[PDB]
Amino acid sequence: GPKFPRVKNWELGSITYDTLCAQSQQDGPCTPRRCLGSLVLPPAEQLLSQARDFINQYYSSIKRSGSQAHEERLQEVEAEVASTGTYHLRESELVFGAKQAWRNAPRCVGRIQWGKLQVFDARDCSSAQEMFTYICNHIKYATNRGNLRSAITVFPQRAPGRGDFRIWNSQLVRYAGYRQQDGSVRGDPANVEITELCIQHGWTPGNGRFDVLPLLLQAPDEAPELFVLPPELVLEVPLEHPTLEWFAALGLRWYALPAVSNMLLEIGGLEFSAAPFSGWYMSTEIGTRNLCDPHRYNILEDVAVCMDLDTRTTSSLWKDKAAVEINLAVLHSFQLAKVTIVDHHAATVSFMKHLDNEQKARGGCPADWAWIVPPISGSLTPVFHQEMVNYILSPAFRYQPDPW
């Protein structure tokens, strides 16, 4: 056979070989001695080679590879790096790179959508106040009264000696998590640290389970500033169940727009430290992880009690039955509100289509099996039966250290 990873689908019996992994310039956490794939978190001349590589990728995607426009852009990029130490992307290069970073994200099941991304160019932004305006506009555009649209807003790149643009919040929409006297948490335990930072920076805290946090925005070399989102901008969905009439009484809800704001977008060696992006939810993110993780809202026991299940024994499958109904409530409620959402069956089926598309387009697709397989009903989805090869390609979305 070919000298490339052989990838098998065990449901269908089909085989492919990944040749794209050959284009990986960056090491992962694994070695011949041990596999670390389950771990969550495992320049000068350097810039120029990353830049040359990215420009070659751009010129391939417009089919002008080896041409005069291609050779002039390279010379232009090295001249700029030569005199300034950095360089700058053309508008169309940024748009290409941002889509390629999404397309490249091994943990993302939503990649069938990768070609459809609204790129807002905010590289002119010069204050925390203006970042706020740009973010409001992003939310308005992306939310679109419930018919959600993928979008990314790109703020100025990191630059020699000058401080970064940073959004401190991990998402544009987050519920407060208030540490209680009895050591427990009201609201979202995930958000305890950012909540306390918000208070330290002068926010007057509420005391509910679903208080929307303000934003902490940091323009270069300045302390962050606090901004409250106008509530009419933040679309939320009250949760009800289609047949269990009491589920509405629980007063649970979730926000419509997942908008990740703490990741670094790297393109051609350029680092965009503030570049929030949004799409729509897969229903298990809300119904399984957010609401049922023991370290999150942890509502499984409450719902099972309402359903009159035997919570005293594992073999009743009370957890499984409750999680299913919570997921159904999420789907039903979003549908009723006409807010875009995708169930884990439709998402994974679309992802199998994406795999095939990318096999033909590029000879493979980097994918992180543990993240792609949904957290309920894994083997009921077609991705469970699909082998996957994980590797890092650039442009990339990367984790970056918290700014405090």
Added chain:
Amino acid sequence: KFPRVKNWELGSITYDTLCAQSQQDGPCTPRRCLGSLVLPPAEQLLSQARDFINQYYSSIKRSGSQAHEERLQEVEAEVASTGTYHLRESELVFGAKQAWRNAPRCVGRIQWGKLQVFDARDCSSAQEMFTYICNHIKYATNRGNLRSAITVFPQRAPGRGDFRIWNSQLVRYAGYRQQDGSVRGDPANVEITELCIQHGWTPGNGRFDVLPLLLQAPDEAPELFVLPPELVLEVPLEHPTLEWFAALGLRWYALPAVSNMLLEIGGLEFSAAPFSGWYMSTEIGTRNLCDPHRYNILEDVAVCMDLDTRTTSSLWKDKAAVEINLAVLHSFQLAKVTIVDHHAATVSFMKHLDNEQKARGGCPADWAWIVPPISGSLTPVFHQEMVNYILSPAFRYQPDPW
């Protein structure tokens, strides 16, 4: 750098130092992770041998003793003269427990110290393999009070064929490929079914026909042996509250006994060494019954439950799966046959991880295999980082003998 290992639910951290003991390369490199893939001289043997003998004497706290030193010399003298050696029965017993302990895909390892080892190395014919297999089954089944066991047949030797059990499990349901595309019975067993027929077996035509065994002594055609129906305990499937469920005519066997893996101890290889324990309910309820390329019963069950089958977003698949798993658990409990649910199993695996941390400084585990196939993040193992690596003694895959 040793790997840092984090539990994301509890915020706790360990460091795996056991992986430094690994001698065998896995599928991954720095360029790319292949973790989700299902399939992969005399001084070489001598150093795996000594290393294993060192493991054994250290296990009995007798390291460096006269017994230890003279055993190293026996092994050495035997390899030098013959190019191979033989294990003492107590070493074999220790090696087989260690192979199980070391299996990264096994969620049931809290049990690893409790294994009945049948030494069948004095086996010289497929007939004799049959008798040993019958006694294993009878012992392991124990009227539903299942007991883990391994029977070890003679090791591979340079100048001859292997002893092999052709079937992948001791109990397997037939799969009959229909002229019109489909399979009757278990589609995973189409090929072994056809092999049995071709070796003279008279086939049935139901969905749950227990296959005969194809047993092979070195360099001989395999022979066919029908298991006595009374030896194969089976559990009819019914549901605690859904009465139409029993009408599905579904059933599974009590005893999961794997018979196609190679057991490697101290550089010696045992090509026939079937082993058995008990089922985790999701193996039957989720995989064997609901995989699309297995019995694929989700639609039938959803229709019986009157669910909306036209749309993914009714979560009909998730609902039928749950009830099927419940049926399995309820039916085994009612038949008084040992079974473990995925919540209990994964809780005990967390305890195992902690035991192994204290005892050995790590534990090789394969996350994709440890996390159950329904309700993943509802179990504690989902939130647990894991480090996968090959320790020896080991169970390995081997080529099919046909």
